[PDB]
């Protein structure tokens, strides 16, 4: 996007000042859309010495004479050329700038416009910068951030010591990764993305996107009227154990609720009977195990059952002991079908196995499982989209790294999911998503497409829960999936 | 406004290109507000070689990639610097320009953006310019004009041979006189006035304005609760004749309906009895005349009746013969009260009388009466605001020149009224307005204020008529005045 600005100026020939005017006015229009008529409000505009601050001076100058009061506090040392030009306009138009503030300044103002730092933030915020940001955050005023809330790293969404908490963020061209990943996503408040006149071809070239309703709608498979269950594919789910009997059931229904034609579970006996007592639609094959866990003695039966399906999901509730490890790795090494690998199948996975598979795979770890899989800490893998991309590319798979914002990548293309809520922060949620992904693969979507559609719909179904989200359970999530699908079109 | 552009560039230091970008985007936003989502429409943008056309190139470039198709037809010979710069951007962005058109081009397009000529129109439009404008007008496409519909003189509203008929006109900074006066007002269609970043102090310095609801609301006099009829003034109306018995009644009620405390009519006997049989609220004094018309023999009685009033209205239905002329001129010469002079009192007026009056006057001619008063043709005085200004200034009066757009001036300040409809194009309408003006003067408004408020409310009352406007009559207009007043606040 910094490249996009440069090219728009240097090669398309758009004056940098025109881009800056467009940025500033889009902030004014956004505020009006959010606050209604601006003419009764008093505005405090906090401007750094960079182009973010220059955008701020455009905002300030365009409010002059139209609102009750504008004051700029200029907090920088020097001004870039466009900031200087726009400071110069603000002052020629009759604007008041001050370079010092007292804590009390917030008193006489209703709206704070945060134009201190944008994408040019480098390093921790300290000093007077930190102090004014902490004062703004304690003030209870309406906060509108220009491009990115000051103090968020726009490439990662991390807080560099302290950051502005905004009610409204107006960003230019495209959302930045720091509006999408937490904590930055939280501090952004309501995000508007403004067109400031970059060529559309450049805006569209960005390789990391947010999954949108329109993208998911165009990916949803067709339901031709002359069809039968075989049209919509077959899934095998290898799951469960004497310890974890519920997982298979949630995974299986997850596949059925997204429109899969036939779902078969392989679950240790008698835990397999659990599934059909709850949903008799499912086929739940009993697997005879020595001690209630899959082992090498079940390898052959599982490969046999795989022959008549389009996709296999494995892992939810398997347990993690050595016999499971041997079974999972020998199975995946021989299985020549797409595989969705989750939960305990990830915990025991030998990643060499993925490199040697000819068939595709999707892996669906939470950060704890991803951390163990690559032998790093949770903090180092959490929201680490570049690590996710490298892993996907090196192992020839799709990686779905689950969190409040979920990252979906095949190594080339990376998509971010922002649907969902904390009702999914509860056992069983993941098991549903595994089934959804397998289901969409069975219906003919690529592993990446299936993952993109499933993460979006899984979170959207959660948002449709009628009562308080903290009471959402996986069973209720399942019931909501077909309403999510309907609302999507 | 050309001065306003210049000062904003040369002295405030706003780059001319920034103004042009702001103009173009405001056109895009206006079209979206009027048409909804633009993405399904095909746009033909007609660009002259001037800055109007440059505004057009900004429009075209900002639609690229976002709508179904854009084509520019460039109709000029050479380009001004800003037009050239913006043509250059349009082409760098992938835009298609052609310099020739065939009649058939309108076929493949839904919206015509008219950026051919703006305020730089000079002289009659001929040639290929005229031809494309005539084709656009026969096409039945949606027409959006940039600044002013091409072919309207923006200082007068006259059509220079031919002009674009627009559905939507987007103008910059302030409405131009040619959007306000006919025929230009008609060709403008729906007018939006966009802020493109001129300092507000400059926009507010313009000396010729449109009368708005807010201006009329703040001028409406106060009604303190501890008041009595004397608080709200007294009007004398000298009017009527054996020929024209209805005029006094409409003038009198006009004063009463705007909140005047007491209204007295002087009307030749027995025609005075007409008024109180219709509205007994009125006082209708019988004047004994020789042959049914006011004459010098009534001078003394009329001056006597004037002593106990705040304002005198004279003229509606007096007739125009020499005895009326002598009476009207001798009366106005001696009357030391504000006078509202209408109809036949204008037809007989000696304008030397106005110059020697110490007290104020409002004159309320239609173009026919103004023409006779200054000894010119109707075509030379119609919508001639500069002539109106000179007349007001030379005779120390307020002139209210009635037409579909009414001009109100005291020589220094000029206001344009755009309320009303063709239901006012009917005998009696004028008589009402005369009473309204006198009434507001009696309540304490200056002659200019009284005229401003009365023209607006008179037209607004007409718009409130429930049925077809052509059936509106003066009696119904009167009944609607207090609803207009209520809707104004």
């Amino acid at each position: 996007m910094k490249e996009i600005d440069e090219l728009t100026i240097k090669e398309y020939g758009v004056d940098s000042r025109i881009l800056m005017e467009r940025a500033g006015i889009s902030v004014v229009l956004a505020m009006e859309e959010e606050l209604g008529n601006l003419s009764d409000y008093r505005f405090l505009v906090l401007c750094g010495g960079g182009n973010n601050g220059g955008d701020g001076f455009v905002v300030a100058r365009n409010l002059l004479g139209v609102v009750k009061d504008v004051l700029v506090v200029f907090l920088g040392k020097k001004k870039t050329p466009d900031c200087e030009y726009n400071y110069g306009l603000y002052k020629k138009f009759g604007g008041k700038v001050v370079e010092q503030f007292e804590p009390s300044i917030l008193n006489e103002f209703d709206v704070v416009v945060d134009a201190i730092f944008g994408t040019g933030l480098r390093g921790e915020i300290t000093g007077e910068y930190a102090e004014i940001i902490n004062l703004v955050n304690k003030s209870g005023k309406v906060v509108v951030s220009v491009d990115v809330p000051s103090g968020i790293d726009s490439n990662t969404g991390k807080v560099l010591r302290t950051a502005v908490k905004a009610d409204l963020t107006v960003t230019f061209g495209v959302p930045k990764i720091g509006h999408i990943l937490f904590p930055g996503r939280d501090l952004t408040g309501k995000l508007k993305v403004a067109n400031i006149g970059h060529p559309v071809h450049l805006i569209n070239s960005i390789n990391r996107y947010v999954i949108t309703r329109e993208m998911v709608r165009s990916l949803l498979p067709e339901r031709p009227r002359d069809s039968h269950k075989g049209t919509y594919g077959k899934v095998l789910i290898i799951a469960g154990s004497r310890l974890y009997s519920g997982a298979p059931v949630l995974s299986g229904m997850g596949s059925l609720k997204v429109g899969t034609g036939l779902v078969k579970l392989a679950v240790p006996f008698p835990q397999n009977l659990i599934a059909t007592s709850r949903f008799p639609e499912l086929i739940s094959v009993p697997i005879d195990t020595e001690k209630g866990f899959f082992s090498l003695q079940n390898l052959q039966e599982c490969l046999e059952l795989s022959k008549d399906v389009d996709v296999v999901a494995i892992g939810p509730g398997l347990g993690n002991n050595e016999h499971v490890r041997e079974f999972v790795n020998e199975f995946l090494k021989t299985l020549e079908k797409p595989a969705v690998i989750d939960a305990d199948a990830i915990n025991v996975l030998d990643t060499s196995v993925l490199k040697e598979r000819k068939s595709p795979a999707v892996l669906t770890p939470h950060p704890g499982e991803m951390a163990r899989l690559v032998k790093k800490t949770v903090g180092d893998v959490k929201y680490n989209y570049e690590l996710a991309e490298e892993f996907a590319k090196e192992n020839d798979c799709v990686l779905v790294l689950k969190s409040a914002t979920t990252i979906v990548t095949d190594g080339e293309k990376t998509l971010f999911n922002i649907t969902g809520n904390t009702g999914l922060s509860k056992g069983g949620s993941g098991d549903v998503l595994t089934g959804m992904i397998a289901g969409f693969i069975a219906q003919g979507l690529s592993p990446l497409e299936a993952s993109t559609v499933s993460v979006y719909l899984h979170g959207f179904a959660a948002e449709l829960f009628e009562q308080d989200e903290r009471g959402l359970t996986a069973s209720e999530l399942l019931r909501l999936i077909p309403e999510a699908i309907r609302r999507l079109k | 406004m050309k001065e306003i552009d210049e000062l904003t560039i040369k002295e405030y230091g706003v780059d001319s290109r920034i103004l042009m970008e702001r103009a173009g985007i405001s056109v895009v936003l206006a079209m979206e507000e009027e048409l909804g989502n633009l993405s399904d429409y095909r746009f033909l943008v007609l660009c002259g070689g001037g800055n109007n056309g440059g505004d057009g190139f900004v429009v075209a470039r900002n639609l690229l990639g976002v709508v179904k198709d854009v084509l520019v037809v460039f109709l000029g010979k050479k380009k001004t610097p800003d037009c050239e710069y913006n043509y250059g951007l349009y082409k760098k962005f992938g835009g298609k320009v052609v310099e020739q058109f065939e009649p058939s081009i309108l076929n493949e397009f839904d919206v015509v953006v008219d950026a051919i000529f703006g305020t730089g129109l000079r002289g009659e439009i001929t040639g290929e310019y005229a031809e494309i404008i005539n084709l656009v007008n026969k096409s039945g496409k949606v027409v959006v004009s940039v600044d002013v519909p091409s072919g309207i003189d923006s200082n007068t509203g006259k059509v220079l041979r031919t002009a674009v008929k627009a559905d939507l006109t987007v103008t910059f900074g302030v409405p131009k006189i040619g959007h306000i006066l006919f025929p230009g007002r008609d060709l403008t269609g729906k007018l939006k006035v966009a802020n493109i970043g001129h300092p507000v102090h400059l926009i507010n310095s313009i000396n010729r304005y449109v009368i708005t609801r807010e201006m009329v609301r703040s001028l409406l006099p106060e009604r303190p609760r501890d008041s009595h009829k004397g608080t709200y003034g007294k009007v004398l109306i000298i009017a009527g004749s054996r020929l024209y018995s209805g005029a006094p009644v409409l003038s009198g009620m006009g004063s009463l309906k705007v909140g005047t405390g007491l209204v007295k009519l002087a009307v030749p006997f027995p025609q005075n009895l007409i008024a109180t049989s219709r509205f007994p609220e009125l006082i209708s004094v019988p004047i004994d005349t020789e042959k049914g018309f006011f004459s010098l023999q009534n001078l003394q009685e009329c001056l006597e009746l004037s002593k106990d009033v705040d304002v005198v209205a004279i003229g509606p239905g007096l007739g125009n013969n020499e005895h009326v002329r002598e009476f009207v001129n001798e009366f106005l010469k001696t009357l030391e009260k504000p006078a509202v002079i209408d109809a036949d009192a204008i037809n007989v007026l000696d304008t030397s009388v106005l110059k020697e009056r110490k007290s104020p006057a409002v004159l309320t001619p239609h173009p026919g009466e103004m023409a006779r008063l200054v000894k010119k043709t109707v075509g030379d005085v119609k919508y001639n605001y500069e002539l109106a200004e000179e007349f007001a200034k030379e005779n120390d009066c307020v002139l209210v020149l009635k037409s579909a757009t009414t001009i109100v001036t005291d020589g220094e300040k000029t206001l344009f009224n755009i309320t009303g409809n063709t239901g006012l194009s009917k005998g009696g309408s004028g008589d009402v307005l005369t009473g309204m003006i006198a009434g507001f003067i009696a309540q304490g408004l200056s002659p200019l204020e009284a005229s401003t408020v009365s023209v607006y409310l008179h037209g607004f009352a007409a718009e409130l008529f429930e049925q077809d406007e052509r059936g509106l009559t003066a009696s119904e207009l009167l009944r609607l005045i207090p609803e207009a007043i209520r809707r104004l606040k």
Binding site: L29, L38 | K192
Partner: peptide
């Protein structure tokens, strides 16, 4: 009613 950009 918001009027920063347009007057009607």
């Amino acid at each position: 009613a918001p009027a920063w950009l347009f007057e009607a």
